[PDB]
């Protein structure tokens, strides 16, 4: 009917997808076996006697993280050939993900995607989840998106990049992988949403009061953002929003599609005790500049287009009252050529809480996805890192011996330089 196809590439994609599919199963009330005891058709298919299989593919070059899904609780939820694993790791190399080992699994991946997409017309789009800091997430991510652009041309392609942090790295060669990925996802994606790890680290320190969080706590918060994004496809609402709606409403120029996301409220079970979660204050905390999910303070940018997804016990008059206060607040800055800069979407179904998680049951929530010119600094910062390391050719011999040519560094750098000049020209 209308459905969306999720692609998870890399270890980051898979572990985010594990949390994402746990939330989707619990909100529609299907058990890990796959059968519940037709609005939800957008994420699950039908296999005979009442039983539902997800519309996703898991892709990884190591066997490790995909075999651990295969032996977990969700053995029979996923189709056995939706979880594709290769033999050897890409090993933090962009060149390995495209030219050496990437070609052997992309053909098998496209066969699965074609079989899963030709059940219906009215395919809404694709969701990609990947890390640009890695080898297989960045390298094979590009190769799949080049292949998808050739076959499925006009379909909407949303990307969720787990972007490298300014301070915390967990890799040394990630400035190389990130600049090469951004060059090649610029001409392949429609909308790219920037997620940073240390942004969610600081959110969970102050809001959830978790001093020592893990990746499993991060991925729950990411899953709540995706749930709020695609809530309108699944549930009935007062003002619904599609997947194809974002590209008409958020991206003003073809190259400018890099955004910043936020979710509010993120409140603990003890913390909910004392607080009225009013529509006015959950929208104030969404725009509160410290509470971004990308570690870019939006005081040093201008907002260009902004999309608010209300979910829950939300009356439309309090949305209009709350967004008017934001516009009149003079520390929030808008670009001159975009006088009206809001899309509001309101859904009825409240956010579902995972048992034994860290979030509390809340009656209403906001997910905000905005385009701003503050993303200029997150591209300048890797560009400072990239020049400092490429100037005397560190780590280059791993890439050039692996199957790509010296010069793709130079081409990717000038493409990023072109993107930086584009953000500067749009602001003035």
């Amino acid at each position: 009917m209308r459905e969306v196809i999720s692609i998870h590439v890399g270890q980051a994609g898979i572990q985010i997808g594990n949390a994402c599919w746990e939330l989707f199963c619990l909100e529609h009330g299907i058990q890990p076996d796959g059968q519940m005891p037709d609005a939800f058709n957008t994420f699950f298919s039908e296999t005979g006697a009442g039983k539902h299989v997800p519309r996703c593919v898991f892709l990884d070059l190591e066997p490790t993280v995909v075999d651990e899904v295969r032996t977990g609780t969700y053995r029979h939820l996923f189709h056995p050939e939706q979880l594709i694993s290769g033999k050897e790791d890409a090993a933090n190399n962009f060149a390995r993900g495209h030219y050496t080992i990437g070609k052997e699994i992309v053909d098998l991946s496209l066969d699965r995607i074609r079989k899963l997409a030709d059940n219906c017309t009215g395919l809404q789009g694709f969701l990609m989840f990947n890390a640009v800091g890695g080898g297989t997430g960045s390298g094979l991510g590009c190769l799949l998106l080049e292949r998808l652009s050739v076959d499925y041309g006009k379909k909407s392609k949303l990307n969720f990049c787990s972007w490298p942090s300014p301070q915390v790295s967990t890799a040394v060669v990630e400035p190389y992988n990130s600049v090469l990925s951004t060059h090649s996802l610029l001409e392949h994606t429609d909308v790219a949403v920037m997620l940073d790890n240390e942004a969610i680290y600081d959110i969970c320190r102050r809001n959830l009061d978790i001093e020592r969080p893990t990746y499993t706590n991060l991925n729950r918060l990411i899953a709540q953002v995706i749930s709020s994004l695609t809530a309108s496809l699944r549930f009935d609402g007062a003002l619904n929003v599609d997947v194809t709606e974002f590209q008409t409403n958020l991206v003003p120029y073809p190259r400018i599609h890099f955004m910043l996301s936020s979710y509010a409220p993120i409140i603990s079970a003890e913390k909910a005790y004392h607080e009225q979660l009013s529509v006015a204050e959950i929208t104030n905390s969404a725009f509160e500049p410290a509470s971004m999910m990308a570690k870019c303070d939006p005081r040093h940018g201008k907002y260009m287009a902004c999309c608010l997804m209300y979910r829950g016990d939300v009356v439309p008059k309090d949305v209009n009252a709350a967004v008017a206060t934001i516009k009149t607040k003079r520390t929030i800055q808008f670009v001159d050529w975009c006088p009206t800069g809001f899309k509001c979407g309101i859904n009825y179904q409240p956010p579902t809480v995972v048992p034994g998680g860290d979030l509390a049951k809340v009656m209403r929530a906001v997910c905000m996805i905005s385009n701003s010119t503050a993303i200029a600094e997150v591209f300048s910062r890797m560009d400072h890192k990239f020049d400092l390391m490429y100037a005397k050719r560190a780590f280059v011999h791993w890439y050039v011996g692996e199957g790509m040519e010296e010069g793709e560094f130079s081409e990717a750098r000038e493409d990023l330089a072109a993107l930086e000049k584009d953000y500067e020209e749009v602001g003035i």
Partner: protein, 426 residues
């Protein structure tokens, strides 16, 4: 007799139209299952204006429900008074115009317009001679503003001399959804100034103002806002369905409001509108109706009427009421607030009296006025349009999808000419 064919387009149009059929069924005494109850001749004698006999004695609306996204049509069917509509009159789409006027009008609107136009012709040719068409849609969206205005163009080519009334909601002034509002609005107006006979403007923000300060309703949902618009929709067409002392149909309203064919944009008002607490305090009389109807605080357009002059205005009264106070109060409002009416028209006001009030009230009035204070709305859309167009912002979604750069310049030129024609009379 005479018939109105109803066409309901977009998510906004479908849920405004779903509650329209709730109020008209209630006033004609139709059970949601389609039967009649109420045992009165006056309800039933003129029912073919909105309904069709179905040889099982049930009445089916002459409504065509049209959308590109199958979500909102499921919602209308599942709700109360949802089993009333004919299932063949639903025309689904699969893809959805993502707030893009291009895909509403040109590319995805084209493959569905053949399907909807077949159904409209089946209903239109079915009667002796129909009176006209009424469309409820939105101009800030894609499928209401794009495909709804395409339908207006096609039906005016086929049936040129029939009346065409449009209940259209506009972008709100202050805070406003769907960031490409001025692209959608400006492109839809120039396709609607040439092809619609009377256009009646609604804002959501004006309706929120009404429900806060007059109705004193604490949590107004879109059910309550649509109920207010449906009240005004029934008041324009009272005289077709019920007898009265002075009848006025839609063409009577058209000949009496619009001096020049280019200017046909109307402000809509309804009275009385009182809170539950203040219902029992008020003297519900013709002088009170006329005071409440001439407020900026009561108009369902976000355009302050005292900043302009009323070119021509009309008041459709309902109930058992005395006609001299219908006449003398309309004289009273012209004389005392003399600065707000234009000079080269003597006796600007039109009155019609119908004998059947809405259910639960004793007397009501609906106001349709051609004001030149609607210049303020077209200037607000036009300067927002010129803000974005100079920088070529969000243009590649439109220009890449099968229109040209020149249609935007034509749209701005046609709407700036509409601004200029209003300015010469004030």
């Amino acid at each position: 007799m005479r018939e109105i064919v109803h066409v309901q387009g977009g998510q906004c149009g479908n849920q405004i139209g779903a509650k329209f059929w709730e109020v008209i069924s209630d006033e004609h005494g139709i059970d949601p299952t389609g039967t009649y109850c109420g045992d009165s001749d006056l309800q039933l004698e003129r029912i073919n204006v909105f309904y069709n006999e179905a040889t099982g004695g049930r009445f089916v609306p002459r409504a065509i429900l049209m959308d590109l996204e199958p979500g909102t049509m499921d919602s209308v069917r599942a709700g109360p008074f949802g089993q009333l509509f004919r299932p063949d009159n639903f025309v689904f789409g699969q893809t959805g115009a993502g707030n893009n006027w291009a895909k509403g009008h040109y590319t995805e609107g084209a493959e569905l317009i053949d399907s909807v136009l077949d159904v409209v012709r089946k209903e239109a040719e079915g009667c002796d001679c129909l009176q006209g068409f009424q469309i409820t849609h939105s101009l800030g969206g894609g499928t209401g503003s794009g495909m709804g205005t395409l339908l207006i163009s096609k039906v005016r080519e086929e049936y040129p001399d029939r009346i065409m009334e449009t209940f259209s909601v506009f972008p709100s002034p202050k805070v406003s959804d769907t960031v490409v509002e001025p692209y959608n609005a400006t492109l839809s107006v120039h396709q609607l100034v040439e092809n619609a006979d009377e256009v009646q403007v609604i804002d959501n923000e004006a309706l929120y103002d009404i429900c806060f300060r007059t109705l004193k309703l604490t949590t107004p949902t879109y059910g309550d806002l649509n109920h207010l618009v449906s009240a005004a929709m029934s008041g324009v067409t009272c005289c077709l369905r019920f007898p009265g002392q002075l009848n006025s149909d839609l063409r009577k309203l058209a000949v009496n409001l619009i001096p020049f064919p280019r200017l046909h944009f109307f402000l809509i008002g309804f009275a009385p509108l009182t809170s539950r607490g203040s219902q029992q305090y008020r003297a519900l009389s013709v002088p009170e109706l006329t005071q409440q109807m001439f407020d900026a605080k009561n108009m369902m357009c976000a355009s302050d009427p005292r900043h302009g002059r009323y070119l021509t205005a009309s008041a459709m009264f309902r109930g058992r009421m005395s006609t001299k106070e219908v006449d003398e109060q309309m004289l009273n409002v012209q004389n005392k607030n003399s600065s707000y009416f234009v000079e080269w028209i003597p006796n600007n006001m039109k009155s019609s009296v119908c004998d059947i009030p809405p259910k639960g009230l004793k007397m009501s009035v609906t106001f349709v006025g051609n004001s030149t204070a609607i210049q303020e709305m077209f200037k607000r859309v036009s300067d927002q349009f010129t803000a974005m167009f100079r920088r070529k912002a969000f243009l590649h979604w439109y220009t890449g999808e099968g229109m040209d750069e020149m249609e935007f310049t034509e749209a701005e030129s046609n709407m700036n000419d509409l601004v200029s024609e209003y300015q010469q009379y004030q």
